[PDB]
């Protein structure tokens, strides 16, 4: 594309950050895209097969716009939204979950967790805003799982369990990001 680039040039989708047999995730950031740098946008390309599950996680600062290209997706964000709560109260917990069809969009705000179920073999394109320094935290699977960095002292005080008992729950998971959510 271009005998005459030096402006925008074309960006495609090169090596994966998360790859394996369940799915793939292709993120391009601003730290590595002058074009996306100027603009503050990050892109991705989520790959998946039916029965594969995209473990619970949340972005630190990026608000991701999920676009459904080819496929059906069960979603699930989870929340804690308002402020005219104030004195604790009102501030309730939500589970917002759905089925994305082709052309169905879903927004995944900054500190919310989420998990994506792939009812079919599935393709999604996301656009995260405020992508600078984005970090993505995992609360399940072996790797990137933050609930597992926490040490036993605290762990058993945080959770109704015991450092190892919990510790087992945490090791239970053989894999990483992507999994099989076999029915049940």
């Amino acid at each position: 594309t271009l005998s005459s680039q030096d402006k925008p040039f074309n960006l495609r989708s090169r090596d994966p950050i998360y790859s394996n047999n369940y799915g793939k995730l292709y993120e391009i950031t601003p730290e590595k895209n002058s074009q996306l740098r100027d603009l503050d946008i990050l892109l991705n390309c989520l790959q998946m097969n039916e029965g594969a599950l995209f473990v619970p996680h949340y972005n630190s600062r990026a608000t991701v716009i999920l676009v459904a290209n080819e496929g059906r997706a069960e979603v699930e964000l989870v929340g804690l939204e308002q402020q005219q709560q104030q004195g604790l109260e009102s501030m309730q917990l939500r589970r917002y979950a759905a089925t994305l069809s082709e052309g169905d969009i879903i927004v995944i705000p900054s500190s919310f967790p989420v998990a994506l179920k792939a009812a079919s073999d599935l393709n999604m394109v996301g656009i995260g805003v405020n992508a600078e320094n984005n970090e993505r935290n995992f609360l399940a699977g072996h790797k990137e799982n933050v609930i597992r960095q926490i040490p036993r002292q605290v762990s058993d005080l945080t959770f109704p369990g015991s450092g190892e008992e919990v510790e087992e729950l945490l090791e239970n998971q053989k894999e990483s990001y992507f999994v099989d959510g076999q029915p049940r």
Partner: protein, 181 residues
């Protein structure tokens, strides 16, 4: 009240999540009452106090926080996916907690308390500051409780019944624990 007598003067901090060794207050939205301090909308102040030998169970905030030691001495652990980083706050000590990083703040041993000043820089929503806890306690249950059992079975590789066991809880005490030993 309702709408600022002009007032730049402010004593009222709402009750977030107190106890027998704790406290947690969040000062109101600067621009709730007054039209005048408009440039201060996207920020919030949380004053939080605690006795000796107590913890503040891990949780993340969806905001960028700047922390401050008003009285006491502390210990800040900050958990990220590859290790934990541990700090000490002591008088005036200040540190900036990056939005979205799970973290637990403690106050070691003695007999003097702990008084921290939390200053929120908001992004996902002006004024809004939501701290997300891993624990099911009297009031709020844990966020890992908002997914389908199917998600939790699939994710975890444990049975809803194994999960729910180290999921939810009585958390009798709640969010400001006591440093067991």
């Amino acid at each position: 009240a309702q709408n600022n007598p002009y007032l730049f003067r402010s004593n009222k901090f709402l009750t977030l999540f107190k106890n027998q060794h704790g406290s947690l207050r969040l000062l109101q939205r600067f621009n709730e009452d007054t039209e005048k301090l408009e440039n201060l909308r996207d920020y919030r102040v949380l004053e939080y106090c605690s006795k000796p030998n107590t913890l503040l169970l891990p949780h993340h905030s969806d905001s960028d926080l700047l922390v401050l030691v008003l009285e006491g001495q502390a210990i800040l652990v900050l958990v990220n996916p590859d290790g934990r980083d541990t700090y000490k706050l002591d008088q005036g000590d200040a540190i900036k907690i990056q939005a979205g990083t799970p973290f637990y703040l403690i106050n070691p041993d003695n007999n003097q308390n702990l008084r921290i000043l939390k200053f929120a820089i908001t992004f996902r929503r002006p004024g809004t500051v939501e701290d997300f806890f891993l624990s099911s306690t009297k009031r709020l249950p844990s966020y890992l409780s908002a997914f389908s059992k199917n998600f939790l079975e699939a994710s975890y590789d444990s049975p809803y019944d194994e999960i729910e066991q180290t999921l939810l809880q009585e958390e009798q005490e709640g969010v400001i624990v006591k440093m067991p030993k």
